[PDB]
Swiss-Prot record, chain B:
Residues 28-47 bind DNA. GO terms for biological process: regulation of DNA-templated transcription. Homodimer. Keywords: DNA-binding, Repressor, Transcription, Transcription regulation. This is HTH-type transcriptional repressor KstR. Controls the expression of genes used for utilizing diverse lipids as energy sources. GO terms for molecular function: DNA binding; DNA-binding transcription factor activity; protein homodimerization activity; transcription cis-regulatory region binding. Residues 5-65 form the HTH tetR-type domain.
Length: 176, 181
């Protein structure tokens, strides 16, 4: 109940800083200072800003975790919520997307944890009860369309609304 | 001119060779101009960056493939065959895949045109293969979804969070989920 408080303050600081100044504002020194932790402690829990941002994203997803007749409607509702959230936080989205661009093997765990989460959130959105294999697969496809189009967005070759459009199109092609 | 097409051809040939042999890092303007036997300035003129070079070369590749028979009986089979071939080519050339992947991740606004152009080529290929002729709008959309799956999983592979095998499997999965028959 003490390491939990530390992790809490740390991911809090991470989220606030990323929200206020984007990826470039997320420095280990800055986060450590804002979270009132030893820098070494921060590095001991999160070896980089990628780990920080991805863990933060994960926590936010698990918190979002805690509406429709057909799987199409329920999933479109889920995608709609997350999409609204994305558009409501441009700089945070920049931070997360950049984090996923720079995420390598060293962040594997932290990334996997997010996958399992968001995929589950999609799968369980589609399924009445335990989700099927195909529904998990569909979730992963959704996430991939999301990430690719976010890659276009980050480099200013597409807008957030373009991302939204592509996602809706994908949902419809998959389970429409 | 006619010499224009020749210059461009040698340039993209050099791009392909260098990228395939030494990956993204190897593709430097002076090296390409050197191997292609052109002036650095004319290179910079026709292709402003290594992103332009790589994306343009990929475009030409898909143009050639589209140019040059037992074919699939369904959209699913034809697209599965297509993706299959491209996938084997991908596994046979990890460094070329690395160069192209980095090219598309690092592609910015100043290349936004070229990207889109090649985006139209690739997709069209897929779409036409699905239709075995004039594609529907939805088949173009499916082409784009396939490309997105490809790019994301290549982003995973690039950063050693996934294998080439995983990329291939994800593509097969996407194909079946989208037009399985």
């Amino acid at each position: 109940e003490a390491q939990r408080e530390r992790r809490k303050r740390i991911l809090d600081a991470t989220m606030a800083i990323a929200s206020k100044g984007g990826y470039e504002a997320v420095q280990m020194r800055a986060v450590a200072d804002r979270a009132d932790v030893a820098v070494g402690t921060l590095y001991r829990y999160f070896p980089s800003k990628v780990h920080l941002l991805v863990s933060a994203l994960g926590r936010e997803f698990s918190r979002i975790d805690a509406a429709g007749a057909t799987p199409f409607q329920r999933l479109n509702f889920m995608v709609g919520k997350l999409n609204r959230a994305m558009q409501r936080n441009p700089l945070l989205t920049e931070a997360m997307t950049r984090a996923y661009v720079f995420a390598d093997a060293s962040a594997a765990s932290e990334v996997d944890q997010v996958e399992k989460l968001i995929d589950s959130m999609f799968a369980r959105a589609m399924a009445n009860g335990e989700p099927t294999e195909d529904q998990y697969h569909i979730a992963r496809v959704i996430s991939d369309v999301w990430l690719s189009n976010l890659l276009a967005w980050l480099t200013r070759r597409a807008s957030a609304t373009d991302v939204s459009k592509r996602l809706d199109l994908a949902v419809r092609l998959l389970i429409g």
